[PDB]
A paper describes a structure:
Mcl-1 is an anti-apoptotic member of the Bcl-2 family which binds to pro-apoptotic proteins containing the BH3 domain, a short α-helical stretch of around 16 residues.
However, when the CHO-Fab was screened in co-crystallization trials with peptide 1, crystals appeared that had not been obtained without the peptide.
Residue numbers in the entry:
A (entry chain H): 1 to 132, 145 to 189, 198 to 203, 212 to 218, 231 to 244
B (entry chain L): 3 to 110, 115 to 212, 215 to 218
Write the structure that this text describes.
């Protein structure tokens, strides 16, 4: 029954602030150093901050120095992370982790809480052609929309063989996706959130 | 960060190693810990103090450390070992933990397949907006891990790049795309553009001229 549970995640605008909490159960919380570690979507783990048993020793990653504050309430079995001047690059799942005294290993981790830093508002996509000889590959670049998703087809779903519709990337604060067809060729893009549909004829 | 290979792979029952290369201030001065992260789940402790296993970790996982490098070996590869593995060490210079970039371990369930790469130039329509996006599409690769590098007039690009996480294709191989964003003036200032995709021990480079 040794568990950690983070809470307080959600959507916040750039420049804004958020306070995360981690509740400890089934162990003497005051006997352990505690850490925050984060992971941006599809990226690696990035250590954020750590606090000693009695808050005497506090460390921060250079990436968060002067913006984040770690604290703890030993009576309330709770760890906190106060995040100020939030930037798009702070978007991540934040985990709290317990550190073993003898070994410094993070032996127990919470489930994580997602923090999304974005001022993006509903935006329709701009659609541009992708064009360059054994086989011709044409495509459509569906640029700068929000939120997900967009649906992409070719020739109103009649052209399905040789098509690759790729996952989206966050490029600034907006999404960008591409679709290609290896073959009079039309890409059909639908973005329901902005009530927009685009049909674009692609020529080499 | 600590340097790890993006991908490691083997067939079930095989022995696979994952390297972790650091510097004197971290691995050179402190113990290395390893974390296993199954897709969409929180990391868990795999190895601590270089070579110790917590309860629940099977003996097929072992760790070692020498100089400024550490290594994780997985013997008798099992399908459930498919995950991302990260090494970590305290850095005495930064007074901070440093993690490796992670290695995805694939347990081969089909033969390897090299990526098919296509490079597209920006459209005149986009250029009218004073922006230029080059698109590097990547399909039909297995294991599902690629590293993308871009060059402009032979010089490596350090900014304005985004690469998707790889996703499964209709045929069960993987696909991904990479983007290079420039201003229209920057596009007009240069001539040669290339997208380089590294997959296992295979690198493919596609180029174009403005």
């Amino acid at each position: 029954q040794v568990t950690l549970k983070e809470s307080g995640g959600g959507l916040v605008k750039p420049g804004g602030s958020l306070r995360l909490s981690c509740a400890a159960s089934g162990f003497t919380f005051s006997s352990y150093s505690m850490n925050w570690v984060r992971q941006a979507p599809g990226k690696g783990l990035e250590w954020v901050s750590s606090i000693s048993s009695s808050s005497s020793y506090i460390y921060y990653a250079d990436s968060v120095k002067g913006r984040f504050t770690i604290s703890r309430d030993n009576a309330k079995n709770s760890l906190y992370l106060q995040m100020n001047s939030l930037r798009a690059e702070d978007t991540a799942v934040y985990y709290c982790a317990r550190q073993v005294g003898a070994t410094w290993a993070f032996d127990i981790w919470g489930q994580g809480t997602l923090v999304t830093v974005s001022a993006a508002k509903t935006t329709p996509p701009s659609v541009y052609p992708l064009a360059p000889n054994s086989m011709v590959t044409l495509g459509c670049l569906v640029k700068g929309y929000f939120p997900e998703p967009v649906t992409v087809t070719w020739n109103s779903g009649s052209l399905s063989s040789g098509v690759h519709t790729f996952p989206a990337v966050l490029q600034s604060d907006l999404y960008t996706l591409s679709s290609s067809v290896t073959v009079t060729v039309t890409c059909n893009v639908a973005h329901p959130a902005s009530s927009t549909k685009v049909d674009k004829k692609i020529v080499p | 960060v600590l340097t790890q290979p993006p991908s490691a792979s083997g067939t079930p029952g095989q022995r696979v190693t994952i390297s972790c290369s650091g510097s004197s201030s971290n691995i050179g001065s402190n113990t290395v810990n390893w974390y296993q992260q199954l897709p969409g789940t929180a990391p868990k402790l795999l190895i601590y103090s270089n070579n110790q296993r917590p309860s629940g970790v099977p003996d097929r996982f072992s760790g070692s450390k020498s100089g400024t490098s550490a290594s994780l070996a997985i013997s008798g590869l099992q399908s459930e070992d498919e995950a991302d593995y990260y090494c970590a060490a305290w850095d005495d210079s930064l007074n901070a933990w440093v993690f490796g970039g992670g290695t995805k371990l694939t347990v081969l369930g089909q033969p390897k397949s090299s990526p098919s790469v296509t490079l597209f130039p920006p459209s005149s329509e986009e250029l009218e907006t004073n922006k230029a996006t080059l698109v590097c599409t990547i399909t039909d690769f297995y294991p599902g891990v690629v590293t993308v590098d871009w060059k402009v007039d032979g010089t490596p690009v350090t900014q304005g790049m985004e690469t998707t996480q790889p996703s499964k294709q209709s045929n069960n191989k993987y696909m991904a795309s990479s983007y290079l964003t420039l201003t229209a003036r920057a596009w007009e200032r240069h001539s040669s553009y290339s997208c380089q995709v590294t997959h296992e021990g295979h690198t493919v480079e596609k180029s174009l001229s403005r």
